[PDB]
Design a protein around this ligand. Structure first.
Ligand SMILES: [Ca+2]
Ligand SMILES: [Ca+2]
Ligand SMILES: [Fe+3]
Ligand SMILES: [Fe+3]
Lengths: 387, 72, 510, 168, 388
C-alpha cells in the first residue's frame, strides 16, 4: 500500500503517543559525552578517540585494560586470546597510542575513495591527452613493466607482514593503525598493477601478465636480497611489534624510500614518464602518513614510556641492528639495476648523494629516537659496493 | 625543515585582487548608469576548490537524509 | 587517444599471482586443517574500490543522522525501554565487530591463496567499520538521547554484570581463541550466517517498532557488508574440503561452534527483544525456529553437505532447551539488576497478556513472580528489597556455567534444569548442559574463567558497583535501575542499606 | 584493603617484586609462580583472583633485568635461564610428536607454557612453538571427540563428581 | 525543553492523524517520473537531464522553448532578457546539448572537492618527504615563479571571457556547461598561485607576491601576443558562442595545450620538478573534460544541426580563421622563452615535434569537424619564426 504495512513508532500516531507518554521531562543524566572517561591526547576528546579507545575488552593484567578476569575461552594449551606474551615490548598502557591523523574507519575510506575516483579521472585525461607518446619505449617496456612491476611483490609482502599484528595487537588504537598501515601497502601494490594494466590498454603490445615482473622478483638479482628480507620480516617474525617496527622504521624507511623516491620518482621524469610518478605520489603520501603513526607508537609511547623507556629503546636498538643488515643487503643488490640504465642516465655521484639523503632522513626520523648509533659513511659505503 | 605544510584558501585569495590588469577595453559589456569602484573587496576569501568543498559537505547531509532515513 | 582507465576486476585478475612460494611461507597459527592455496574469493575487490563503496554508504548514514534525524529529534522520541536495550545491543555487538577484526586477521594469516587472504582482509576492514558504527550508535544516543549513562561508558561499566562474560565467549574469545578453522565456524559459518545476519535486520524491526530510527539507519548499512562475510565463511569450508583431516575434524568443530553460539544468543537475544521493548514484532520462539532450524540448520547447512558438512548433532538439544531459555534468563537479569549498566522494566499488563498468549504457561510461572516482586516494592528504593533476596529466601541458587558463562538457576528454571558439579585439583566447577561439560572435561585449560560470585565473593554490593564506576555524573545515583521511569531512582546508598554480600553458590557442596 | 583492581594481596606482591634485582632470582620466581598459580594444574587456587595481574607485574621485572644482563645475540636466542631457545623449542616439539595420546600431549603443551612463557623464552621461538605444539594437541584431541561417554570421560579426566542432576 | 516547542506533522500524533486521514488510497497518477517529457540523449532519461533541461523559461520564439509570449520586463530600449540576437549561430533546438560527463551541480562540486582535499594531502606529503631538495634553483625561481606564474593571468583572462556567456547562454544545458568551463579556468589560475604560495613556505626566499609574474604578463615579450589575444577574446567579443568556441576550439586548444603540455609538463621533470606537474595534471584533466562538452555543443549539436549545419560550419570556420592568426602570434612570441633555458635543455627538433603534436591534435579534434582546411606545415613554420 502507499502507506506500507509496518507501522513505525516515530510516525505512527497511536504508537508515538504511547512512547511520548513514557518519556521523562529531561535526560536522566546531563553527561551526554560518550567516552567522557577517556584521557584526551589533545585539548578536547576527539570523535576518533571516543569511537576507538577501549573497544578492546582487555583486563587489567594487560597494561591499560579496564576489565577483570581471564578470557572466557582460550587456545588449546592455554594460550590467551590476547596476552603480554606476544611481544617483547612493555608499557604502562597499551591504549596510550594515538594516530596523529586521527583516522577511524569512515575518514580512512573517505580519503582513499577520493584518491581512487581522481585516479580514474586522471587516467582518462592522460589517455585522451595522448601523453604516452612522449614516453621512452625502453623505460616503459623495461623499467616499468619489469622492475617497477617486480616491486609490487615487495609491497605485497610488506602488506602480509601485518597479518599477525592485525590479530595480536594489544589495543584498539594500535590495531586500527596497524591495519591501516598494511591496507595502504596492498593498495600501492595494486596501483602498480593498475598502471601496467593501463599501459596494456594504450600501448599495443604491452603484456600486463604478472609473469615477467614476478619472475624478476622470484629469480632476479636486483631484488634477491630485497625478497629475502621481505620473506623474513613476513614469515620469520612472530612478535607483532618487531614486525611493524622493523618494516616501517628500518626496511621500508631505507630500501623502500630509496627505490620509490631515489630511483623511480627521480628517473621516470627523465624518460618522458609522468604516469608512474602519479602513483608514486600516492605511495609517498601514504608513507608519510604511516610514519606519523609509527613514530607516535614506538617513540612517543613506548620509547619514552615513563616506566619502560630504557627497556624498550634497548629492544628497538636490537631490532634495528638485526634488520639493518638485511636491509643493506637489499640496497646493495638493487645497485645492480643502475648498470642496466642507458649510458649517461645517472652517475655514481647522483647515486651516492641520493643514498645519503635516504640514510640521513632515516637517522633523522628513526635511528636517533632510540639512540641507535648509526654511521652514514659506513652504511652508504657498504651499499655502494653494489654498483 | 620538512614539517608537513600546505596552503589554504585565504592564503591564495590574498593575491586575487591583483589577478585583474589594466588595458583599453577592460570595461563592462552591459549598459549601466553607475561606476563600480574597481578596488572593491569581497567579504568571503574563497577560491574555487574551497567553495566546492563546503558546498559538497552540505550536499552529503541533504542527499543522505533524502535517499535514506526520509525515504525509509 | 580515447579516454580509458582501469577498474578493480581488471587488476584483481592478477591478484592470485601476487603470492609466491618459499620456505617458511606458512601460517603462524596452529590448525588441524590445510587451506588449499588456490582458493578463490567471490568478490573481485581492491583496496581503492573497497574504500569507495564503503564511503558512499557512509555518506547516506551520517547524512541522515547529522541532518534529518537530528532535526526530527529521533534520538529522543524512542521508548524508554528501548533506549536502555540499545545500550546493551550496540555495545555488546561492538565487541563482536571488534574481535571479528582480530579473527579475520588470523584467517588472513591462515589463508595461503592470495585471493582467500584478500577475501578475509576485506572483512578485517569491515569489522573495523562495524566496530566504529556500533560505537556511533551509543555515541549518538548518549549525545542526543533521554539517558546517556551506560551509552556513554559501557566499555567499562559493562564489566560489572554477568551478561557481559557470556558475550565475550561467543563474540570475543570464540572468535579468536582456538584452531583458526574452529574460530571461522564460530564467526562466519555459524555466528554470522545463523545469528548475526538475521539478527541485525531483526534489531532494525524492533527498533522501528519502538521509535528508534537511529539504529535502522546504521545497522541497515552494516547489513550491506554481510554478504562478503558469508562468502568468506563458505570459502573456508571449500579450502579445506579436500584435506583428509577435514573428514575427521570438521563436523566436531562445527557442532561445538553451533552449540557455543546458540547457548548464549538463544536466551539473550530473545530476552532483549521481548523484554527490552514495548512494541513487539514477533514471538522469539517463531523467530528462532525460522533462523536456526530452517534457514540455517536446513537450508544453509544443506548446501555445504557436498563438502562433508552435516547437521550439528546437538541441534535437537538446542531446540528443546530453547523454548523457555529467554524467559528463564530475564528472571536472573532483573533479579541482579544492580549489576548492569542499563535500566530494566517489569512486564506491563498488555505485555503479560501477550506473553501468555504466545507462551502458554507463562503467567502461572514468571507472571506471578514478577507481580510478587513488584508488590514487595522491587521498583521502590525505600522497600529495601532486591529480587536477589527472593532467590536466597526460597533456596534457588544461581550458578554461572564454567564454559559459556551463562547464568542459570536449575531449581527454578522451566527450560533446562540439569546441573553437574565437579571438583578437580582443588577447584569446583558448575555446568548447565552435557555439551559444555564435555568441552571442559576434554579441554580444562581452555575454560578457567572466573565468574562474578568467585570474584565478588565476600564483597558488599554497593562497594563493587562504586569500585567499577556504576554511577551517574552525580556520583550518587546508580546507572542501573529496576524500572524505566524518570523519578525515584535508586542511589548507591539505597543499595548499601540492603547490606547485600556476595557468596560463591558452589561452596555449599562442602 | 579489599578491591578488585587494588587490594592488599596485590600490594603485597608489588613489594616482593621490587626486591628482585638479579635476573636469576627473579626469573626463578616467575617460573615458580607459574607452577604454583597458573593452569588447571596449579599447585593451589589461593590467588585465582590476582595471579594474572601479579604474573604480568612479575614478567615486567624479569624483562627489564634480562635486557640489562643479556647481550643482543643472547636476548634474541637465549632463555632467561641461559638455555638455547631453539634447542628447547625443537626439543619440546620432538616429544610432542612422540606423544602417544592426547593425555600425554596436553601435559607437554601446558608444561611448556609454565616454564618458557616470555620473558623466559624469546617471543619468536615461544609463539613458534605455540603453533607447532597446539596443532598436534588438537589433532589428538578432536579425533573421535564424542566417542567416550561422559561417565567414562569424567573418570579419565580424574575429576571428583560432587553432584549430578538430570530430569531427562 | 527535551521535546521542543514546535510540533511536526510527520511525528506529532494529533497532526499526523489529520494528515493520514486526508491521503488518497494510491497516487493520483502513476507517472512518478519528473521530466518524463524530455527527449533522452541516451537509453534512459538521466538524473542530470531531469534536473537541468527546460529549467530556462524560454518561449517558442527562441529555438526549442516551451513557453509562449514575450518576456515580462525588458531592457531600456526593448532588448529581451534572452534572444536570438545575442549569437550568430542558429539551431532547431537550444536544449539539444548534453554534457557527456552529465555534470549537474552536486557531482561537479563533489569531484572538485575530492581534488582539493587530495591536493592538501599531496602537498603535506611532498613537503614532509623533502623532495624540494632535488629541484633545480633556476628552474624554480625563474621558470616557475616568473613564467608559469605569469600563465595564471592567461587562464584568469580565459575565465573572465565566460562572464557574458554565463549571462546570455540560450539554454540551461549550455549555461551550466559554460559556467563549469570557466569555473575550471579560474581554479587552474588559483592552483598556479597556490603552488607559488607553497614554495614560499618551504623555500626560504621565494616571494609569492604576484608582482613579478604580473609584470612579466603585462610588460613581457614572451606572453605579449598571448595577452593581446586574451584581452581580445575576453573584451572585444560580444557573441557568447564565438567566445566559448574561439577560446576552447582555437586559442586554448593550440596555445594553451602547447604551454601547459609541450613546455611545462614536458620540461619540469627534467629539472627535478614533480610539483608543477601535479597541478598541470589537473588542468589537463579539466581541459579534456571541457573538450567533450565543447565538441558536443559546437559539432554534434550545431555543426551537424539538421537545419543549420551548413550555416553554422561557415560561421565557425569564419571564427577559426579570425582567431587562428592571433593564436599563432601568441605561440610565436612564446617561442622566445626557449632561448632563456640553460643550454642543451631542448633543441629545435623537439620543439618542432611538440608543436606538430599540438597542431595535429587540433586538426584532429576541432578543425576537421567543421571542414576548416588547415595546413600543419604552414602553421608550425609561422610559429617557428619566433625562435631566437
Ligand atoms: Ca615581441
Ligand atoms: Ca637532436
Ligand atoms: Fe560486522
Ligand atoms: Fe560481519
Amino acid at each position: 500500500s502507499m502507506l506500507g504495512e509496518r507501522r513505525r513508532g516515530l510516525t505512527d500516531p497511536e504508537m508515538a503517543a504511547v512512547i511520548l507518554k513514557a518519556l521523562p521531562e529531561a535526560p536522566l543524566d546531563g553527561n551526554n559525552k560518550m567516552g567522557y572517561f577517556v584521557t584526551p591526547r589533545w585539548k578536547r576528546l576527539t570523535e576518533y578517540e571516543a569511537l576507538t579507545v577501549y573497544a578492546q575488552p582487555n583486563a587489567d593484567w594487560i597494561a591499560g585494560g579496564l576489565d577483570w578476569g581471564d578470557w572466557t575461552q582460550k587456545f588449546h594449551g592455554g594460550r590467551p586470546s590476547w596476552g603480554n606474551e606476544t611481544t617483547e615490548l612493555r608499557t604502562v598502557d597499551w591504549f596510550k597510542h594515538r594516530d596523529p591523523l586521527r583516522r577511524w574507519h569512515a575518514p580512512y575510506v573517505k580519503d582513499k575513495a577520493e584518491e581512487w575516483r581522481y585516479t580514474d579521472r586522471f587516467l582518462q585525461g592522460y589517455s585522451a591527452d595522448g601523453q604516452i607518446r612522449a614516453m621512452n619505449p625502453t623505460w616503459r617496456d623495461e623499467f616499468i613493466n619489469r622492475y617497477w612491476g617486480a616491486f609490487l611483490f615487495n609491497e605485497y609482502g610488506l602488506f602480509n607482514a601485518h597479518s599477525q599484528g592485525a590479530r595480536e595487537a594489544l589495543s584498539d588504537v594500535t590495531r586500527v593503525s596497524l591495519a591501516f598501515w598494511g591496507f595502504d601497502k596492498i593498495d600501492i601494490a595494486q596501483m602498480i598493477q593498475l598502471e601496467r594494466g593501463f599501459l596494456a590498454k594504450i600501448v599495443p603490445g604491452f603484456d600486463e601478465s604478472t609473469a615477467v615482473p614476478k619472475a624478476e622478483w622470484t629469480n632476479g638479482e636486483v631484488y634477491k636480497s630485497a625478497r629475502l628480507a621481505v620473506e623474513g620480516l613476513w614469515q620469520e617474525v612472530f612478535d607483532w611489534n618487531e614486525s611493524a617496527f622493523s618494516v616501517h622504521a628500518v626496511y621500508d624507511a631505507l630500501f623502500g624510500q630509496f627505490v620509490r623516491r631515489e630511483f623511480f620518482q627521480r628517473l621516470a621524469p627523465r624518460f618522458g614518464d609522468n604516469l608512474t610518478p602519479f602513483f608514486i605520489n600516492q605511495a609517498q603520501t601514504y608513507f608519510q602518513i604511516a610514519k606519523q603513526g609509527v613514530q607516535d607508537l614506538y617513540y612517543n609511547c613506548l620509547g619514552d614510556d615513563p616506566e619502560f623507556s630504557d627497556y624498550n629503546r634497548t629492544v628497538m636498538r636490537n631490532w634495528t641492528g638485526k634488520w639493518l643488515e638485511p636491509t643493506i643487503a637489499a640496497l646493495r643488490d638493487f645497485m645492480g639495476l643502475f648498470a642496466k640504465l642507458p649510458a649517461g642516465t645517472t652517475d655514481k655521484e647522483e647515486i651516492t648523494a641520493s643514498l645519503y639523503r635516504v640514510v640521513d632522513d632515516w637517522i633523522e626520523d628513526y635511528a636517533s629516537r632510540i639512540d641507535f648509533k648509526a654511521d652514514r659513511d659506513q652504511i652508504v659505503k657498504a651499499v655502494l659496493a653494489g654498483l | 625543515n620538512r614539517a608537513p605544510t600546505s596552503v589554504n584558501a585565504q592564503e591564495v585569495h590574498r593575491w586575487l585582487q591583483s589577478f585583474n590588469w589594466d588595458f583599453k577595453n577592460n570595461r563592462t559589456k552591459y549598459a549601466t548608469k553607475y561606476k563600480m569602484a574597481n578596488e572593491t573587496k569581497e567579504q568571503f576569501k574563497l577560491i574555487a576548490k574551497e567553495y566546492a568543498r563546503m558546498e559538497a559537505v552540505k550536499d552529503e547531509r541533504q542527499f543522505g537524509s533524502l535517499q535514506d532515513a526520509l525515504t525509509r | 587517444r580515447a579516454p580509458t582507465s582501469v577498474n578493480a576486476q581488471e587488476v584483481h585478475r592478477w591478484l592470485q599471482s601476487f603470492n609466491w612460494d618459499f620456505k617458511n611461507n606458512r601460517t603462524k597459527y596452529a590448525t588441524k586443517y590445510k587451506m588449499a592455496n588456490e582458493t578463490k574469493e567471490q568478490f573481485k575487490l581492491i583496496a581503492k574500490e573497497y574504500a569507495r563503496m564503503e564511503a558512499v554508504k557512509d555518506e547516506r548514514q551520517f547524512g541522515s543522522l547529522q541532518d534529518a534525524l537530528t532535526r526530527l529529534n529521533a534520538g529522543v522520541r524512542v521508548h524508554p525501554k528501548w533506549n536502555e536495550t540499545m545500550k546493551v545491543v550496540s555495545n555488546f555487538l561492538e565487541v563482536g565487530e571488534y574481535n571479528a577484526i582480530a579473527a579475520t586477521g588470523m584467517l588472513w594469516d591462515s589463508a595461503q591463496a592470495a585471493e582467500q587472504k584478500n577475501g578475509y582482509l576485506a572483512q578485517v576492514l569491515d569489522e573495523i567499520r562495524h566496530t566504529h558504527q556500533c560505537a556511533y550508535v551509543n555515541y549518538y544516543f548518549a549525545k542526543n538521547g533521554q539517558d546517556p549513562a551506560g551509552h556513554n561508558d559501557a566499555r567499562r561499566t559493562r564489566t560489572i554484570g554477568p551478561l557481559w562474560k557470556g558475550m565475550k565467549r561467543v563474540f570475543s574469545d570464540g572468535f579468536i581463541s582456538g584452531d583458526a578453522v574452529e574460530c571461522s565456524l564460530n564467526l562466519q559459518l555459524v555466528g554470522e550466517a545463523c545469528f548475526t545476519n538475521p539478527l541485525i535486520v531483526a534489531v532494525t524491526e524492533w527498533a522501528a517498532a519502538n521509535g528508534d530510527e537511529i539504529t535502522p539507519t546504521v545497522f541497515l548499512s552494516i547489513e550491506t557488508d554481510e554478504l562478503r562475510h558469508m562468502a568468506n565463511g563458505y570459502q573456508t569450508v571449500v579450502s579445506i574440503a579436500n584435506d583428509p583431516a577435514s573428514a575427521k575434524y570438521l563436523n566436531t568443530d562445527l557442532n561445538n561452534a553451533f552449540w557455543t553460539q546458540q547457548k548464549y544468543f538463544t536466551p539473550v537475544l530473545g530476552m532483549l527483544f521481548e523484554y527490552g521493548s514495548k512494541f513487539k514484532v514477533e514471538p522469539w520462539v517463531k523467530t528462532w525456529d525460522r533462523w536456526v532450524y530452517e534457514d540455517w540448520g536446513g537450508i544453509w547447512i544443506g548446501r555445504l553437505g557436498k563438502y562433508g558438512v552435516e547437521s550439528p548433532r546437538s541441534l535437537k538439544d538446542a531446540k528443546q532447551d530453547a523454548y523457555w531459555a529467554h524467559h528463564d534468563l530475564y528472571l536472573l537479569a532483573y533479579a541482579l539488576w544492580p549489576t548492569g549498566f542499563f535500566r530494566l522494566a517489569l512486564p506491563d499488563q498488555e505485555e503479560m497478556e501477550w506473553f501468555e498468549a504466545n507462551y502458554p504457561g507463562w503467567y502461572d510461572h514468571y507472571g506471578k513472580i514478577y507481580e510478587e516482586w513488584r508488590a514487595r516494592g522491587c521498583e521502590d528504593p525505600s522497600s529495601g528489597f532486591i529480587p536477589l533476596m527472593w532467590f536466597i529466601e526460597n533456596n534457588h541458587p544461581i550458578y554461572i556455567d564454567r564454559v559459556s558463562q551463562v547464568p542459570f538457576c536449575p531449581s527454578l528454571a522451566k527450560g533446562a534444569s540439569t546441573l553437574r558439579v565437579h571438583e578437580y585439583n582443588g577447584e569446583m566447577h558448575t555446568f548447565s548442559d552435557q555439551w559444555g561439560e564435555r568441552m571442559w572435561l576434554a579441554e580444562p585449560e581452555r575454560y578457567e574463567c572466573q565468574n562474578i560470585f568467585e570474584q565478588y565473593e565476600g564483597r558488599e554490593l554497593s562497594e563493587v558497583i562504586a569500585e567499577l564506576h556504576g554511577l551517574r555524573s552525580d556520583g550518587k545515583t546508580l546507572i542501573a535501575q529496576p524500572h524505566v521511569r524518570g523519578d525515584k531512582l535508586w542511589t548507591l546508598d539505597d543499595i548499601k542499606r540492603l547490606n547485600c554480600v556476595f557468596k560463591n553458590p558452589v561452596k555449599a557442596f562442602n | 584493603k579489599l578491591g578488585i583492581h587494588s587490594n592488599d594481596t596485590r600490594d603485597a606482591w608489588v613489594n616482593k617484586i621490587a626486591q628482585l634485582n638479579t635476573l636469576e632470582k627473579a626469573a626463578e620466581m616467575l617460573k615458580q609462580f607459574r607452577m604454583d598459580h597458573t593452569t588447571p594444574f596449579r599447585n593451589s587456587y589461593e590467588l585465582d583472583n590476582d595471579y594474572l595481574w601479579i604474573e604480568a607485574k612479575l614478567e615486567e621485572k624479569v624483562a627489564v633485568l634480562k635486557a640489562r644482563a643479556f647481550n643482543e645475540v643472547d636476548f634474541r636466542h637465549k632463555t632467561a635461564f641461559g638455555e638455547d631457545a631453539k634447542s628447547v623449542l625443537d626439543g619440546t616439539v620432538a616429544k610432542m610428536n612422540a606423544a602417544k595420546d592426547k593425555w600425554e600431549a596436553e601435559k607437554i603443551h601446558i608444561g611448556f607454557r609454565q616454564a618458557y612463557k616470555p620473558p623466559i623464552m624469546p617471543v619468536n621461538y615461544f609463539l613458534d612453538g605455540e603453533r607447532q605444539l597446539g596443532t598436534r594437541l588438537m589433532e589428538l584431541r578432536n579425533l573421535n571427540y564424542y566417542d567416550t561417554p561422559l561417565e567414562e570421560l569424567r573418570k579419565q579426566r580424574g575429576v571428583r563428581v560432587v553432584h549430578l542432576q538430570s530430569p531427562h
